[PDB]
Design a protein around this nucleic acid. Structure first.
Ligand SMILES: NC[C@@H]1CC[C@@H](N)[C@@H](O[C@H]2[C@H](O)[C@@H](O[C@H]3O[C@H](CO)[C@@H](O)[C@H](N)[C@H]3O)[C@H](N)C[C@@H]2N)O1
Ligand SMILES: NC[C@@H]1CC[C@@H](N)[C@@H](O[C@H]2[C@H](O)[C@@H](O[C@H]3O[C@H](CO)[C@@H](O)[C@H](N)[C@H]3O)[C@H](N)C[C@@H]2N)O1
Ligand SMILES: [Mg+2]
Ligand SMILES: [Mg+2]
Ligand SMILES: [Mg+2]
Ligand SMILES: [Mg+2]
Ligand SMILES: [Mg+2]
Ligand SMILES: [Mg+2]
Ligand SMILES: [Mg+2]
Ligand SMILES: [Mg+2]
Ligand SMILES: [Mg+2]
Ligand SMILES: [Mg+2]
Ligand SMILES: [Mg+2]
Ligand SMILES: [Mg+2]
Ligand SMILES: [Mg+2]
Ligand SMILES: [Mg+2]
Ligand SMILES: [Mg+2]
Ligand SMILES: [Mg+2]
Ligand SMILES: [Mg+2]
Ligand SMILES: [Mg+2]
Ligand SMILES: [Mg+2]
Ligand SMILES: [Mg+2]
Ligand SMILES: [Mg+2]
Ligand SMILES: [Mg+2]
Ligand SMILES: [Mg+2]
Ligand SMILES: [Mg+2]
Ligand SMILES: [Mg+2]
Ligand SMILES: [Mg+2]
Ligand SMILES: [Mg+2]
Ligand SMILES: [Mg+2]
Ligand SMILES: [Mg+2]
Ligand SMILES: [Mg+2]
Ligand SMILES: [Mg+2]
Ligand SMILES: [Mg+2]
Ligand SMILES: [Mg+2]
Ligand SMILES: [Mg+2]
Ligand SMILES: [Mg+2]
Ligand SMILES: [Mg+2]
Ligand SMILES: [Mg+2]
Ligand SMILES: [Mg+2]
Ligand SMILES: [Mg+2]
Ligand SMILES: [Mg+2]
Ligand SMILES: [Mg+2]
Ligand SMILES: [Mg+2]
Ligand SMILES: [Mg+2]
Ligand SMILES: [Mg+2]
Ligand SMILES: [Mg+2]
Ligand SMILES: [Mg+2]
Ligand SMILES: [Mg+2]
Ligand SMILES: [Mg+2]
Ligand SMILES: [Mg+2]
Ligand SMILES: [Mg+2]
Ligand SMILES: [Mg+2]
Ligand SMILES: [Mg+2]
Ligand SMILES: [Mg+2]
Ligand SMILES: [Mg+2]
Ligand SMILES: [Mg+2]
Ligand SMILES: [Mg+2]
Ligand SMILES: [Mg+2]
Ligand SMILES: [Mg+2]
Ligand SMILES: [Mg+2]
Ligand SMILES: [Mg+2]
Ligand SMILES: [Mg+2]
Ligand SMILES: [Mg+2]
Ligand SMILES: [Mg+2]
Ligand SMILES: [Mg+2]
Ligand SMILES: [Mg+2]
Ligand SMILES: [Mg+2]
Ligand SMILES: [Mg+2]
Ligand SMILES: [Mg+2]
Ligand SMILES: [Mg+2]
Lengths: 46, 93, 271
RNA sequence: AGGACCGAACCGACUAAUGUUGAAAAAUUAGCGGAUGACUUGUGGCUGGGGGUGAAAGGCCAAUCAAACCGGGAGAUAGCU
RNA sequence: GCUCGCCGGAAGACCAAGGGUUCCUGUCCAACGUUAAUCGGGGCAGGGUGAGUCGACCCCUAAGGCGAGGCCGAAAGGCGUAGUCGAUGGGAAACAGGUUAAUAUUCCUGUACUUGGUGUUACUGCGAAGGGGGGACGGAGAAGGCUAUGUUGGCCGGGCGACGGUUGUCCCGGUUUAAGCGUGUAGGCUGGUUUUCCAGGCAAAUCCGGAAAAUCAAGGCUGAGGCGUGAUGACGAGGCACUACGGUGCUGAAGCAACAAAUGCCCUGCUUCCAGGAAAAGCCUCUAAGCAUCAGGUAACAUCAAAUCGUACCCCAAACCGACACAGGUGGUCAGGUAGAGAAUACCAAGGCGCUUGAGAGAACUCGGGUGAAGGAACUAGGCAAAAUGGUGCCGUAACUUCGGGAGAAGGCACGCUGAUAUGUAGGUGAGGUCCCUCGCGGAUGGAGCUGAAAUCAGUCGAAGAUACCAGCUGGCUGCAACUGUUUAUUAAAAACACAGCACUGUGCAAACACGAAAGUGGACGUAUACGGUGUGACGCCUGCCCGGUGCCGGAAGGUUAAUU
């Protein structure tokens, strides 16, 4: 059966990438929260 | 003109392997490790000045580094650049 | 001419089409073509604002001259063409100076016919004049509402406006709806009726034919649940409500016009 | 010519048996419907939660839907166990 | 290694997406692998991805995104102009052969091609952010001409058979060659040329558009394939020769024709239809400002350059999505032989596999199948399931009907093989030869050779000839829904939804209505033969009475009644 995760790198980066997060103030707050938690990976970018 | 500082930085090491040896002794091609940011023109000029050999053409590829495990800890080796430098049929490097 | 189809299949049995052998069979005139993509009834918020819109055949837009501004220069009708953007047919006309335009094709216009616009133009179908120069009692179409704006009324297939009275700076017009409206006398009109009057005699015949025209299915309010529509709900078929729109407004008789800015121009409503 | 006919690909899912700590959190086997169309499919895009979308089943919106998920008010309140 | 079995429109081959070293070699067997493991997609080490032409980057735009100023909004923000991004689409150029353990249109060999920078020569009006052209476009259908490809014959090399026969009308193997360059054919489109003039193309134009004469009758464009060259080459059966027995050195014959033939090409064509079928750049062309014995343009030649990144490997799957080495899911390309209408189905080729526990035994019972006396729905809620039917041609086919249907109604007959007609017919194809020719890829004639249904007559075998696989059960009465469609992903596919049609009602355009504190946007680049809402639901015959209640519409005298004063 067709499962929910159908990978596409371009869609992944356009939806969740660094530049997508920085384009909006709420995405920038996502980055701030993850930096404050100390995540080794801020975004799906790499 | 590429400067000599750049030319002395560009070449890193000779590459040793069965394919490299066969290239040298069949097609007069030396296989070199070069700088990751080195262009074909830079490799040609550097080889021509530092090894004093006339170069026919340069082919390059980027070698992706291997993921390895050291002491049950996961690391990765660096990518490097390999250059196939064909000499002009009488050079003997 | 209206032709009933033979019942060779259930989707064909009830089809009645309008075939016009006088329409151009080739491609439209390219310099007067533009693109127009479909909306799906969606506005710039991405939301559906008009229901039942979507799909249908791709269509290019034909630039049609509603202003009719080349006055003094005669034009010859090069041909009649099908226009997918409207119910009326259009006419490719060539001006004596070498310019080509599209116009709404009035009834009786044929290739080779001559037309002209301006105050000095003759009074015959296809000619465009200010209604101050058009006689009272005339049948006109493509009627301007503001001088120089371009025709806005009586543009559909087979429609026309009747000049009923002239008083001062204003003409009174009878519109297809039955309304009596005041328009400035300096507004232009084109003599005659819009052609293709048999447009209303076609029978689509099947659901797919409506789908071809970009119309999506209408679901009755009673067929829904209460959360979806005021008419929804009921074990079996129940109504017991005053009929309303999906947004709760009475939909059988309740008037919705509220324009005090243009009230003064209406002599009589359509009734 | 045809929302025409029979029938593969392709799309679907009417019956039965199996399976039900499965090979599988919806399938397999044998049959079954559509198969030039209101068809089907790849890539990309848009619509956001009392909101969307719905040929309308309260269906669907990431195995979650008569109001998604995540974090917070929050140790809600619990005459109940 | 030999044998057996399985797939073969796939269970073969090449990719995109996704993964990321899983690729190759050596080495090890703890753990991982549903068993063992010397093996592995496992551990460890080393190796491996070579491009002017393939792809990306790049130029160009779609949907859509963002958006200088700006407009709007308590703030955050929303929208949007100029623009700028954004492929799933448009835009230059490379092929064949050889080679590695592992890359190859990338390396080597041979033979090419494109675009640009210079410089020499010759000629010369160049010039854009502007104008025009072009790019540039649908569905269905029909046919011709071809090719890929296949079959047979010919040819070359070899063979003479474990058991009757096999020097022949016998058997086996091979019978391949590209891009490019030249030529310009089947087909398709279009009348050409010169002269004068002009309210159009945001200005100009010699370009496009329009008008008016003369003149000639063929001029142009496009275009598969073929042919020649590329190629005295390459490849090539085999033969000879090494092995550290996994692979490699030398040498090399023939390499043709006929027939069949696409879903590929001519074809972005042609015919027809309505539901009327992107954009922009590259490209061609025209001028403006302007440059103006400069620049620049065209042509030729020589020279230089063409960067960067990807390239291993899997890719219907043990490497992707499914927690698994999981009977699931996953877009594109290719399409051999016999039979067959076929990409169905059966059996095979090339290629790939036997699905990572085995070995016995031959109880009940479960699962998946085969057969079955006599009966034949008696079973059961119910013929559920099973059994049965099943092809082509021909004959023949009822009520009813909206005249299309019903209909494949129902039912019935023929069907293998051999010979004759005719040692291969009708048809299709068509060599040499022969004549003519606005002379070549021409025409007419002629039929050799090749291919090749179908019918009739005669005979013949079997229980059975549509023999396997494959492949409708049929008829009658009645409810519902007109019909094709849609739906509860995962217990409901239906009489439910939709539907064409009908009706009522709103709406005069800054439309009603909808999304939006707004600006705006959709409706619609539409304009009452239009658009929205509501109910009903093809079609036929029809749709009666009630306005008291609730709603809606109209009225505005009178009574009552807000802020205000
Ligand atoms: N399994 C056996 C293989 C299978 C493949 C099949 N195509 C054939 O292939 C052979 C093929 O038949 C042979 O052609 C011969 O025979 C043909 C007629 O039969 C003739 O047209 C031809 N002129 C003649 O030379 C060829 N020499 C070798 C091929 N391997 O036999
Ligand atoms: N004019 C007379 C027509 C002639 C054509 C014929 N096909 C039939 O058509 C009818 C058709 O049979 C009817 O189906 C019935 O019978 C089927 C089989 O027994 C059942 O599966 C079905 N449940 C049952 O309803 C149908 N209801 C209406 C059709 N008009 O009678
Ligand atoms: Mg090279
Ligand atoms: Mg490279
Ligand atoms: Mg509607
Ligand atoms: Mg409706
Ligand atoms: Mg309706
Ligand atoms: Mg409705
Ligand atoms: Mg509704
Ligand atoms: Mg319901
Ligand atoms: Mg309600
Ligand atoms: Mg009820
Ligand atoms: Mg009720
Ligand atoms: Mg059909
Ligand atoms: Mg479904
Ligand atoms: Mg099935
Ligand atoms: Mg059917
Ligand atoms: Mg079918
Ligand atoms: Mg319900
Ligand atoms: Mg769900
Ligand atoms: Mg709630
Ligand atoms: Mg609290
Ligand atoms: Mg608690
Ligand atoms: Mg073997
Ligand atoms: Mg590894
Ligand atoms: Mg391996
Ligand atoms: Mg083990
Ligand atoms: Mg052991
Ligand atoms: Mg390994
Ligand atoms: Mg700003
Ligand atoms: Mg914006
Ligand atoms: Mg834009
Ligand atoms: Mg761009
Ligand atoms: Mg693309
Ligand atoms: Mg490989
Ligand atoms: Mg051929
Ligand atoms: Mg590869
Ligand atoms: Mg397994
Ligand atoms: Mg699997
Ligand atoms: Mg598939
Ligand atoms: Mg098959
Ligand atoms: Mg047994
Ligand atoms: Mg048993
Ligand atoms: Mg048993
Ligand atoms: Mg049994
Ligand atoms: Mg049985
Ligand atoms: Mg029996
Ligand atoms: Mg019996
Ligand atoms: Mg019986
Ligand atoms: Mg009984
Ligand atoms: Mg009975
Ligand atoms: Mg009983
Ligand atoms: Mg049954
Ligand atoms: Mg059966
Ligand atoms: Mg009954
Ligand atoms: Mg129905
Ligand atoms: Mg009916
Ligand atoms: Mg009825
Ligand atoms: Mg159906
Ligand atoms: Mg269900
Ligand atoms: Mg079901
Ligand atoms: Mg209406
Ligand atoms: Mg308007
Ligand atoms: Mg408007
Ligand atoms: Mg509006
Ligand atoms: Mg309407
Ligand atoms: Mg409606
Ligand atoms: Mg109904
Ligand atoms: Mg109904
Ligand atoms: Mg309706
Ligand atoms: Mg009052």
């Amino acid at each position: 059966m067709k499962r929910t995760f159908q990978p596409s790198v371009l869609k992944r980066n356009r939806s969740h990438g660094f530049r997508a997060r920085m384009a909006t103030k709420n995405g920038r707050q996502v980055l701030a929260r993850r930096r404050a938690k100390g995540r080794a990976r801020l975004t799906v970018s790499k | 003109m590429i400067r000599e500082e750049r030319l002395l930085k560009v070449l890193r090491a000779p590459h040793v392997s069965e394919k490299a040896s066969t290239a040298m002794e069949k097609s007069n091609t030396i296989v070199l490790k070069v700088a990751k940011d080195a262009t074909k023109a830079e490799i040609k000029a550097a080889v021509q000045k530092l090894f004093e050999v006339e170069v026919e053409v340069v082919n390059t590829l980027v070698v992706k580094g291997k993921v390895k495990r050291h002491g049950q800890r996961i690391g990765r080796r660096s990518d490097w650049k390999k250059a196939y430098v064909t000499l002009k049929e009488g050079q003997n490097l | 001419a209206v032709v009933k189809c033979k019942p060779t299949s259930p989707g064909r049995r009830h089809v009645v089409k309008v075939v016009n052998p006088e329409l151009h069979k080739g491609k439209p005139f390219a310099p007067l073509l533009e693109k127009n993509s479909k909306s799906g009834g969606r506005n710039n918020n991405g939301r559906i604002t008009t229901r039942h819109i979507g799909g249908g055949h791709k269509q290019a837009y034909r630039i049609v001259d509603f202003k009719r501004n080349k006055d003094g220069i005669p034009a010859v009708v090069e041909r009649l063409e099908y226009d997918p953007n409207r119910s009326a047919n259009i006419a490719l006309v060539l001006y004596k100076d070498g310019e080509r335009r599209y116009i709404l094709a009035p009834k009786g216009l044929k290739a080779g016919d001559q037309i002209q616009s301006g105050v000095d133009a003759a009074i015959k179908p296809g000619n465009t004049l200010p209604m101050r120069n058009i006689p009272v009692g005339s049948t006109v179409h493509n009627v301007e509402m503001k001088p120089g704006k371009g025709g806005q009324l009586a543009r559909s297939a087979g429609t026309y406006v009747q000049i009923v009275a002239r008083d001062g700076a204003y003409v009174t017009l009878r519109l297809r709806s039955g309304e009596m409206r005041k328009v400035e006398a300096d507004c232009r009109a084109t003599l005659g009726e819009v052609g293709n009057a048999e447009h209303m005699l076609r029978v689509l015949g099947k659901a797919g034919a409506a789908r071809w025209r970009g119309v999506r299915p209408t679901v009755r309010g009673t067929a829904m649940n209460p959360v979806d529509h005021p008419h929804g709900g009921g074990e079996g078929r129940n109504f017991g409500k005053h009929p309303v729109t999906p947004w709760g407004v009475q939909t059988k008789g309740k008037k919705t016009r509220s324009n005090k800015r243009t009230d003064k121009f209406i002599v009589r409503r359509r009734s």
